[PDB]
Amino acid sequence: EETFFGNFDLASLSLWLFYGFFALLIYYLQTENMREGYPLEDEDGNTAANQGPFPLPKEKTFKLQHGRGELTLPGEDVQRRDNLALRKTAHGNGFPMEPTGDPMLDGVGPASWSKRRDVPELDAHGHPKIVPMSAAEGFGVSAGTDPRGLPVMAGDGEIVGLVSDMWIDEAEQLVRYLELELDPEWGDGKRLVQRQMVRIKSDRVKVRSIYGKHFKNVPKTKSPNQVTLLEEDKIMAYYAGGTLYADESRLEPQL
Amino acid sequence: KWFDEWNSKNPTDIYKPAIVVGVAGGAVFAAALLVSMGQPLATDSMQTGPR
Amino acid sequence: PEYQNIFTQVQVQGPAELGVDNENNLTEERTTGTGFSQLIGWIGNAQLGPIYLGWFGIISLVTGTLWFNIVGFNMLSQVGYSIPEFIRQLFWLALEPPSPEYGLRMPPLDDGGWFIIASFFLLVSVISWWLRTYQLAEMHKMGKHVAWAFAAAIWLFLVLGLFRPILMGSWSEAVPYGIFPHLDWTTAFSIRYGNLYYNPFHALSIVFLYGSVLLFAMHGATILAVTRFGGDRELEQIYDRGTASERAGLFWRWTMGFNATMEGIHRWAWWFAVLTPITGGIGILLTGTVVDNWFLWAVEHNFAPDYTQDYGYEAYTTYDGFLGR
Amino acid sequence: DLSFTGLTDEQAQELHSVYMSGLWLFSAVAVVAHLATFIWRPWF
Amino acid sequence: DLSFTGLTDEQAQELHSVYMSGLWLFSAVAVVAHLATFIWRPWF
Amino acid sequence: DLSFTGLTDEQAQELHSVYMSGLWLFSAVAVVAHLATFIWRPWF
Amino acid sequence: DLSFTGLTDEQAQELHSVYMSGLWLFSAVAVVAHLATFIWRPWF
Amino acid sequence: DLSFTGLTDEQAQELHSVYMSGLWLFSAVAVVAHLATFIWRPWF
Amino acid sequence: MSKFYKIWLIFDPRRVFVAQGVFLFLLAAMIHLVLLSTEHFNWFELAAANA
Amino acid sequence: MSKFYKIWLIFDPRRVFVAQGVFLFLLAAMIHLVLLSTEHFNWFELAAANA
Amino acid sequence: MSKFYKIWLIFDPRRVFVAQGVFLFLLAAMIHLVLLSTEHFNWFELAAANA
Amino acid sequence: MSKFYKIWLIFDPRRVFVAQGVFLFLLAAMIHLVLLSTEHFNWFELAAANA
Amino acid sequence: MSKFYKIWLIFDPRRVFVAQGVFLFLLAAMIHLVLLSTEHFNWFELAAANA
Amino acid sequence: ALLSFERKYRVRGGTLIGGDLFDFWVGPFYVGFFGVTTAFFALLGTILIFWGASQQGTFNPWLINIAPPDLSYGLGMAPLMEGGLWQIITICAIGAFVSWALREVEICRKLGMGYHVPFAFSVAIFAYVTLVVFRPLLMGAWGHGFPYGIWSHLDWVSNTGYAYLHFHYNPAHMLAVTFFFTTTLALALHGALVLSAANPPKGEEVKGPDNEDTFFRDFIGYSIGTLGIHRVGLLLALNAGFWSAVCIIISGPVWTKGWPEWWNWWLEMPIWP
């Protein structure tokens, strides 16, 4: 085989062509990932002077099922929160924020939730996706330990009530939530706990994220037979906020 | 004595610290047993090229 | 400690799911009969089956079975039809490609005819499976990304088996059908044409393979980390952004200065995985046809390292000193 | 003064005696064992 | 009046004055160092 | 007036005074050390 | 005045006195051990 | 006054006094050790 | 040294005791396993010793 | 000096004592092991040397 | 030329200062290192040779 | 020089003391090990060579 | 030159101080290490050679 | 410059050590105690590498080579030009990797999520430490580590592989290669399925998890689910790393002869006639 000029042959041509293609592909991949969260803002809520070297992409349209309309991105932020109880700890940018009231009750920090749609998620048939186990026909426990009837222990060793039901995902045959009936001392009504934050034992179910006194302020569902995306977000994040805000020692340095 | 003041002045997990102490002595015990598999069977090498 | 979501605490079982349908009538070809495995339910889904039986699938199954039986019976006959010896030497037998002296002509059955027949069957089976994977996506109303990613690997398959032997003008350039023989072929191919380390496209394919493994580790860890916010339901997060996507993006933005979206990370994963066989096939296709020594190519192109020290054991120690005498 | 355990001076002073009596006896036993071992095979 | 950073004209002038004041000092120190180095070992 | 950090003029002047006071001491110590090192082993 | 732990002044003084009393005994025992070791086998 | 930590002027002065006393004690101990080491085995 | 009893005003006594026992047991373990030294120190072996 | 007692108005005694104990034990173990890893300062064999 | 001050109506000084400092230090280090890779201007080797 | 006490109006002493202690101990350990890694200043080997 | 104090209306000291603290120690350590890798300015081998 | 949803997450706390002394951001990056340590170690390592490159006599990226000492130096320290710079850079790299992992831990704690990512990074750190620390320590010399060069760290791999005649006959190498290939295939399939579900042909509605489940049950007769696939991928990657470490660590200190000969236990079993 011969060379076109100097040491340049077919392999070098292929290598340079691949270099060009890879550069274009990297540009495309980076630009495709800027459809959420832009343009950038400063710490006062205003548009920043610097926006980066990659310009914004063009628009694309999603056609959603069940007649819920269309979604076009990039666009305005419809999940934006309105009034946040936060305070700046400095006059410039690059410094943390300070909660104004109760961070667990105000939904800030690790307890933050997003403003999702106030409608339940639907399966292929158009039914609510997550349903209590007492309304699902033909479903039963096949393995593991049944948590129904067991007492619930909080993060500080307090028993707050019993597990009364489970909320399952009928389409995927997976358990999503555990329902809890509270003792009159610790509150009233029923509360939901996501399955990812519980440890089922032979005689008890333990929730280490929050303490006993934090159980009465868990967000409640409006309907007893379904839950919406907004409620799931608020319930699930309230439970996540306790890993930091349930005690003063969880926030200060461990050393 | 009078008592062990274990009525309302002792809400304590008497075992918590010792469990951590015992766990500490666990990983330092298994490391010796792991390095024991290979050190008694020493090996020597002969260099035949640049470093 | 906190629950880590690696094994499921409690399982539930309901009526079996038969599958969605549309006017294409997918039901007419699906089988009837399902099972449940509690052992697998600790990790993933427990329902097993049903499967879709088209014509491409049946053709592929029959033809691949024919290839398997041809290879197995040739290996059995090579040992004298002794079952204990067939079991003893299973990892060492093979169905060898033809001899170099026959070029591209059809060789005798003793020296490569069965190899060609089995290769033809294997090619037919693989193409049938690809057509099936295209047809299924066409009938469920979905994109054809699965077909493209399979075609990415089929490209390297064909380059290793069909295109390069034709370009080099010999059927003896193929790979033998065996466990240890195919590794022997890999090593001999690497040695025969210089050093395959100094082939730039082998390096590029290695780069993309490492990146793909790293990216799945990262993505699996990230998704399991934010699963307490319903992070495993990725499609609903794409259609309606929640807090899980925001936290997952902010983790990587605070870690390395840039992040992705719930839909854009899958594009990254698809491309890193697909780019490996493409670069590998491009690099393999150039060996022998264009470049015959890759170390000499590197030396001529000035990226081969140079060493100053000497060679030999006598430049560093003594034979008696090594023994301890 | 300060007490994060919930005892007074008298309680700590009484609870220290048992600990000191044990420590000072477990050590005498260790000293006798060490002396016996040294008599057996010296290591200095 | 164009402004992407939110500054005023007078603010920009006052900033540029001090910026150039520092730049000239940096350049003078570099020039002295270069002269001394050239006196030590020439390159031209 | 331009102020990104929220400080006033007098505060900035005081801060600069203290910063320069520290810098001069650092430089003097470095100069003494360099003189001693050059007397020990010259590099010019 | 300044108290990040909520402790008063006299309690801190008493605590420091006890801590120094323990530290001196520990140091004395270590010094005796080091002197005996050096007598047995010098390292200088 | 300017304070990012919450302390006052008097508290900062009081803290700095003790910090400098500790620094001087540490430096004196290090100087004595260095002199002994140099006498034992001299570098430079 | 006269006021060393005040450590219990700071530390819980029983949590200290359990951890102390665990630490002492592990310390004794090692020293007896290291003293299983084939010099003038291993005595478990007495069969291949001096019988 | 004289005013060094104010360190207890800055640091919490419990964590200070725990860290001090852990650090001292680790330092003592490291020094004893380093002595054991030498030739001139291994007391198990020096007795056999003078035996 | 008399209107060069209008660059700060386009660029934020906070980012420009950081970028300029990083660039200047990197350039100075690169030049000081490039001088040391030769033989005529390597002051360490020249000092060694003149003694 | 007489107004250096204002550094504590910028930094929290509680979070500075721990870092200072860690830095000082790590520096001391590094310097002692660096001395141990040579031949002229390895005080463990001069003891053996002298005797 | 007399208006250099206005940099503190641009930058907060809390970040600049830590950046400078890291930079100075990095510079000192590299320079000392670079000196230690030569033959004319290595003060450890000089003491051994001189003795 | 923040994202439009980032400000409410930028709160204080969640630090293992340092409090508010280092609790701030520099651009997008988060700074802490371990960020400072990482910056120091990485900058020192890079500058030392370029100093060694300058003293070698070349600045070509393809040709820079910093090598470990000779085998005669043992486990002691070598002159900084004859391989000591390699040891210093190795120490710096270990420190930087550990600091990076702990910074990831701090970020995870602040965001209130799980600690899976630092645990996954720990396996790669373990593999690197096995390559540069454990195996040379067992073999008895620091000269068994690979050099720090772009093209010179492949010659080491080649020579180490050919030191046992045929490295493809190593069973742990077989396991690791199989895990690597399986991980790549699973990643490709997962990405393709998600992208096809979210991007239908023009004029068609988007799909859901039920559609994906049906597709793979029609395709191969089994579906792992939207949650099991991530577990499977994570486990595959971790297993690949672990078995790579095992394969490299058994080659030198445990086995000495050629690898093909290891199969004589199977080839000479008493059951065979």
Ligand code: BCL
């Ligand atoms: C003659 C050559 C021999 C051979 C000899 C060897 C030897 C010898 C080795 C293996 C190793 C491996 N072999 Mg083999 N191997 C051969 C050919 C093959 C073939 C093939 C023919 O197809 C395959 C598929 C493989 C594949 C493999 C993997 C199983 C394994 C790679 C380790 C790994 O990925 O750890 C990945 C882990 C890491 C080391 C990652 C470390 C990452 C660190 C922690 C972070 C980096 C930070 C960075 C500096 C940041 C800076 C960047 C900033 C942005 C600036 N081998 C041939 C047959 N093989 C290697 C192995 O198992 O190693 C343990 C190895 O050493």
Ligand code: BCL
């Ligand atoms: C001594 C060995 C030589 C060497 C010789 C080769 C050779 C020769 C080759 C590789 C190739 C590769 N090398 Mg190399 N390589 C070496 C050292 C290494 C090392 C290392 C030391 O760590 C690494 C990391 C690798 C790894 C790699 C990969 C990057 C690459 C494989 C591409 C791929 O996607 O494979 C994945 C495999 C495939 C996609 C094959 C196609 C699969 C098809 C689709 C199968 C169809 C299904 C089937 C018919 C049905 C089965 C039955 C079912 C159960 C129904 N090499 C040394 C230097 N290397 C390949 C390449 O591309 O290099 C350019 C290649 O050919």
Ligand SMILES: CC[C@H]1c2cc3[nH]c4c(c3C)C(=O)[C@H](C(=O)OC)c4c3nc(cc4[nH]c(cc(n2)[C@@H]1C)c(C(C)=O)c4C)[C@@H](C)[C@@H]3CCC(=O)OC/C=C(\C)CCC[C@H](C)CCC[C@H](C)CCCC(C)C
């Ligand atoms: C890596 C992907 C490859 C693959 C995977 C694969 N196929 C699978 C599975 C998997 C992981 C199953 O779990 C499922 C199965 O039933 O396995 C036993 C199956 C399957 N794929 C099949 C065929 C098949 N797949 C093909 C494709 C592939 N298989 C891919 C290339 C091909 C090819 C290449 O042509 C064929 C011929 C069927 C045999 C089966 C579809 C299941 C079905 O139609 O009915 C099964 C249900 C039952 C009637 C009962 C369960 C079956 C049990 C074996 C009996 C009882 C066991 C008990 C209920 C629990 C099982 C225990 C577990 C440990 C399995």
Ligand SMILES: CC[C@H]1c2cc3[nH]c4c(c3C)C(=O)[C@H](C(=O)OC)c4c3nc(cc4[nH]c(cc(n2)[C@@H]1C)c(C(C)=O)c4C)[C@@H](C)[C@@H]3CCC(=O)OC/C=C(\C)CCC[C@H](C)CCC[C@H](C)CCCC(C)C
């Ligand atoms: C992006 C590149 C990566 C990749 C991708 C990839 N591979 C793919 C795909 C994709 C996207 C598919 O869609 C396709 C698939 O079906 O995946 C589930 C496939 C596939 N890649 C495969 C293998 C494979 N991929 C590999 C690698 C890779 N593929 C790359 C890493 C490798 C190697 C060497 O690393 C191999 C060996 C298959 C599992 C499958 C292709 C199936 C096929 O072509 O089947 C044809 C049919 C036959 C040959 C008939 C076989 C008959 C048997 C004798 C019995 C029936 C099968 C039975 C299930 C096995 C035995 C079971 C026992 C219980 C009896």
Ligand SMILES: COC1=C(OC)C(=O)C(C/C=C(\C)CC/C=C(\C)CC/C=C(\C)CC/C=C(\C)CC/C=C(\C)CC/C=C(\C)CC/C=C(/C)CC/C=C(\C)CC/C=C(\C)CCC=C(C)C)=C(C)C1=O
């Ligand atoms: C679904 O979910 C998911 C997401 O979401 C939706 C995701 O997104 C992702 C993420 C995935 C992707 C984005 C895909 C692309 C990813 C890859 C291809 C992986 C490979 C990545 C890379 C090659 C890039 C990685 C780059 C690195 C590690 C380098 C970056 C680091 C730095 C520049 C330094 C770090 C900064 C520190 C430590 C802070 C600074 C230190 C200090 C002490 C501050 C003090 C100040 C100073 C020192 C001075 C000022 C400092 C400056 C300016 C810093 C710069 C300094 C220099 C010297 C240059 C995944 C997986 C996911 O599943």
Ligand SMILES: COC(C)(C)C(=O)C/C=C(\C)CC/C=C(\C)CC/C=C(\C)CCCC/C(C)=C/CCC(C)CC/C=C(/C)CCC=C(C)C
């Ligand atoms: C050679 O190199 C190596 C590393 C191998 C070494 O060998 C190095 C070894 C060391 C460095 C070793 C160091 C060892 C120590 C410093 C050990 C110290 C040990 C102690 C201080 C132990 C003290 C034990 C005290 C006891 C047991 C006293 C009393 C106990 C009791 C009376 C039990 C009952 C107690 C109470 C209070 C009643 C119970 C009431 C309740 C309410 C719980």
Ligand SMILES: COC(C)(C)C(=O)C/C=C(\C)CC/C=C(\C)CC/C=C(\C)CCCC/C(C)=C/CCC(C)CC/C=C(\C)CCC=C(C)C
């Ligand atoms: C030989 O070949 C090779 C490739 C090897 C080379 O070596 C090639 C090298 C090059 C090509 C090098 C090129 C180098 C350059 C182009 C360098 C340029 C450098 C500059 C322009 C530097 C300018 C620096 C200016 C400074 C530091 C000025 C002022 C700073 C300050 C005054 C700081 C204080 C600021 C204040 C107070 C402003 C605040 C004011 C208010 C009113 C708020």
Ligand SMILES: COC(C)(C)C(=O)C/C=C(\C)CC/C=C(\C)CC/C=C(\C)CCCC/C(C)=C/CCC(C)CC/C=C(\C)CCC=C(C)C
């Ligand atoms: C030779 O080639 C190679 C590459 C090898 C090199 O070695 C290259 C080397 C270089 C290129 C080196 C370059 C070096 C520099 C540019 C160095 C610059 C150094 C400085 C500018 C240092 C500045 C130091 C300043 C100091 C120490 C100031 C103050 C310190 C204080 C402790 C004061 C603290 C202030 C307070 C408390 C103010 C509080 C006031 C209130 C009102 C609250």
Ligand SMILES: COC(C)(C)C(=O)C/C=C(\C)CC/C=C(\C)CC/C=C(\C)CCCC/C(C)=C/CCC(C)CC/C=C(\C)CCC=C(C)C
């Ligand atoms: C040779 O080359 C290599 C690279 C190998 C090197 O070795 C290079 C080495 C270096 C470059 C080393 C550099 C080292 C330094 C820069 C070291 C600096 C050290 C210090 C600045 C140390 C300071 C120590 C200060 C101390 C100890 C102060 C105080 C201590 C106290 C115990 C005081 C306690 C304070 C109280 C109680 C205040 C309470 C008051 C109230 C009001 C509550």
Ligand SMILES: COC(C)(C)C(=O)C/C=C(\C)CC/C=C(\C)CC/C=C(\C)CCCC/C(C)=C/CCC(C)CC/C=C(\C)CCC=C(C)C
């Ligand atoms: C040779 O090179 C290498 C690297 C190998 C080395 O070996 C290097 C080694 C070093 C660099 C070593 C460095 C070592 C140090 C810096 C050591 C420092 C040690 C101390 C400061 C030790 C302090 C110990 C103090 C003690 C033991 C105090 C005890 C106190 C008490 C027991 C009192 C109990 C308190 C009570 C009861 C509180 C009262 C309560 C009330 C409420 C009143």
Ligand SMILES: COC(C)(C)C(=O)C/C=C(\C)CC/C=C(\C)CC/C=C(\C)CCCC/C(C)=C/CCC(C)CC/C=C(\C)CCC=C(C)C
């Ligand atoms: C956790 O926080 C708190 C505050 C509670 C603490 O820090 C608590 C800490 C403790 C409770 C610590 C406890 C520590 C001990 C109990 C330590 C005990 C130490 C010893 C008993 C050490 C003994 C060492 C003896 C040695 C080294 C003997 C050596 C002998 C020879 C080498 C023989 C040669 C001797 C000759 C020739 C005699 C010459 C000697 C002369 C003195 C002249």
Ligand SMILES: COC(C)(C)C(=O)C/C=C(\C)CC/C=C(\C)CC/C=C(\C)CCCC/C(C)=C\CCC(C)CC/C=C(\C)CCC=C(C)C
């Ligand atoms: C007899 O006993 C029974 C019945 C039990 C059996 O049947 C036993 C069977 C066995 C024990 C079987 C064992 C089988 C193996 C160990 C098989 C191993 C197979 C391989 C490793 C195969 C590799 C194949 C291919 C490779 C590596 C690359 C590329 C190949 C191709 C592209 C092939 C395609 C060929 C083409 C396009 C050429 C066709 C020719 C024409 C003229 C069109």
Ligand SMILES: [Fe+3]
């Ligand atoms: Fe995913």
